[PDB]
């Protein structure tokens, strides 16, 4: 429920290579829901490529 925001600073260099691509900045300042939940229905198969 608090700290509904973020702020400054970070580390040197970065990767966070999500699949392809990389990017390199000073780490990152970012929120996420405090420990987020599924909250929805994903149990009817999934399928793939």
């Amino acid at each position: 429920e608090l700290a509904s925001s973020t702020s400054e600073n970070s580390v040197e260099t970065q990767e966070i290579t999500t699949f392809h691509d990389v990017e390199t900045p000073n780490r990152i300042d970012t929120p996420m829901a405090q420990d987020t939940s599924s909250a929805r229905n994903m149990d009817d198969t999934h399928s793939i490529i």
Binding site: E1, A3, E8, Q34, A39
Partner: protein, 300 residues
């Protein structure tokens, strides 16, 4: 077969006895099927992993109150003056202090003034109760570049706040808060150097020679009514430059100072607003001329 042996019990017809309480047993008839109808846990219902209604966390939600402008021109030992609203003199109270007056036309013989208060998450909650008590936290940020150099001072002063009441509002008396008439030598302070640090979070514990403080704030505060305002803060934080702001012509002669607000270790008291009017959320009309709805305190 046998006759009564039970005594006569005393009565009183008092339906909805103490319906204003949070705990107890409600007598409302559930329009359902099962007498024990009830939903499960909030799991999977919401994404939040923390009770999203606990006072402590709601008030812990940071929010910007000021965005002052510090010019290389400004003089030291003088709380940054500037419009915005306040700033150099933050009421350091939990309730809200800042407010703007929306004046609309009704005729060439009168206007309608409506107070608009930009309360933060913590100030928004403090409006539901009469008195409060907590430790106010403020994170002062100085948006700038590594080329700007300075040393801002932030000192706290308990007691009344030097102000200049208006026929419909209340502002600070900057004239009464200069380094000469307002020496901050004995006042708890901190000197943020722009070349070393860029931020600082100052936590101000509750101190008001009073168990609790009113939550009136700036509501209906003016020349004739400014008492509830004082009895609702306990002090004020002053931001006066210790060393004049330095900045080459290669950059900007200005620096924005963002200040966040929120409270911790909060404890509210009476479940009723201290304002003279029912809690009402200001709703921005379609046009700057449209009139707003005003709620009264009359009962039929």
């Amino acid at each position: 077969k046998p006759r009564n042996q039970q005594q006569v019990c005393p009565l009183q017809n008092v339906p909805a006895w103490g319906y204003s309480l949070y705990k107890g047993i409600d007598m409302s008839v559930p329009l359902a099927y099962d007498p024990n109808n009830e939903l499960g846990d909030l799991k999977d219902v919401f994404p939040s992993a923390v009770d999203e209604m606990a006072i402590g966390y709601v008030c812990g939600n940071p929010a910007v109150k000021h965005v002052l402008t510090w010019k290389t021109t400004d003089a030291i030992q003088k709380p940054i003056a500037n419009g915005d609203d306040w700033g150099g003199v933050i009421p350091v109270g939990m309730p809200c202090y800042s407010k703007s007056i929306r004046t609309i036309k009704i005729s060439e013989t009168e206007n309608r003034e409506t107070e608009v208060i930009d309360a933060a998450p913590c100030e928004y909650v403090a409006n539901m109760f009469s008195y409060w008590r907590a430790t106010m936290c403020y994170r002062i940020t100085v948006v700038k570049t590594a080329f700007h150099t300075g040393r801002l001072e932030i000192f706290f002063e308990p007691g009344v706040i030097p102000v200049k009441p208006t026929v419909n509002n209340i502002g600070p008396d900057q004239d009464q808060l200069t380094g000469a008439v307002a020496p901050s030598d004995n006042n708890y302070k901190y000197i943020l150097d722009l070349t070393n640090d860029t931020e600082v979070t100052i936590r101000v514990p509750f101190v008001s020679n009073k168990m609790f403080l009113k939550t009136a704030g700036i509501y209906g505060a003016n020349s004739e009514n400014n008492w509830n305002f004082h009895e609702s803060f306990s002090g004020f934080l002053c931001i006066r430059p210790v060393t004049k702001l330095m900045a080459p012509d290669t950059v900007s002669d200005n620096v924005s100072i963002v200040v966040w607000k929120w409270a911790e270790d909060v404890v509210v008291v009476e479940p009723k607003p201290l304002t003279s009017g029912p809690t009402q959320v200001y709703r921005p009309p379609p046009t700057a001329s449209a009139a707003v709805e005003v709620l009264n305190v009359e009962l039929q």
